[PDB]
Each structure stands twice: as structure tokens, then as C-alpha cells.
Amino acid sequence: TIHMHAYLHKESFKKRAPKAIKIIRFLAIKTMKTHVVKFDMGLNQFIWSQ
RNA sequence: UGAAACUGUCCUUAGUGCAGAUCUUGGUGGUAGUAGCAAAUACUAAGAAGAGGAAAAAAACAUCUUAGAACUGAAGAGGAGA
Numbered sequence A: 001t002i003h004m005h006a007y008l009h010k011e012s013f014k015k016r017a018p019k020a021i022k023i024i025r026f027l028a029i030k031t032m033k034t035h036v037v038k039f040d041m042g043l044n045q046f047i048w049s050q
Numbered sequence B: 001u002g003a004a005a006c007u008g009u010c011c012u013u014a015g016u017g018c019a020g021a022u023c024u025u026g027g028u029g030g031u032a033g034u035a036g037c038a039a040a041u042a043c044u045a046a047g048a049a050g051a052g053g054a055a056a057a058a059a060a061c062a063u064c065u066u067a068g069a070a071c072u073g074a075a076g077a078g079g080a081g082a
Helices: A017-032 A041-047
Strands: none
């Protein structure tokens, strides 16, 4: 579970959904040690759902 | 270094000697890798093409398709004329 409210606290509104992708990319780099991170289209559609 | 013209002496002649004219023309510095590349709400994911996202996150990647999210809001960022 990624508590993204912690990362997106008081962040500029026009950069909240784009930044959520940047955080999930970074959490995948630090855990699997790979720089080739591919998002499933279902996850991206959920990040932008609101 | 340069490869085809030139020099010394006596007279004659002058478009004859530059540091200045906010001089003329051309070239070039410091400033300085500095000031800046901040109006027009906004982009994201997958795929394709391409030399052109690599990597100890180098956090950003132009074009086209699809999906999401959006703006002009019909006296329009629409469709046409002088």
C-alpha cells in the first residue's frame, strides 16, 4: 500500500496526478532495482480517475 | 615561416609618417555561461517509427495511434468569405 496522501500533501494542484506517477516509478526503482518501470494502463486510469 | 619579385646611392615628385576628432569601415573582448528562454488552466499511460531515455532516478523524452484527463464554450481557440 502506497500512502500517497503523505507524498501529495500541499502539492500544487495542477501537478498531483502527474506526480503520483513519478512517485510510484521511484518506489519501483528503489525496491526492484530496475529503471525500466512500466505502468499498467489500468493503474494510470485510476490515478487520473478524479 | 614564405615562394617571385626586390634593393642601395643621387636628384625629381607627393593622395608622404597618427593614440585621440561621440572620428570612418571592419574585426574582437570584459560584463558572461551572466540577465533571461515565467500571459494564453495540462498533461499522463501503453504501443509504433527513429541514431536519438539513457541511469548508481540523468525525476524532464519531440511525431503518430489508442485509453484517460482536460480547454475554447457556439458574439468560439468552430465552418467560410472581402
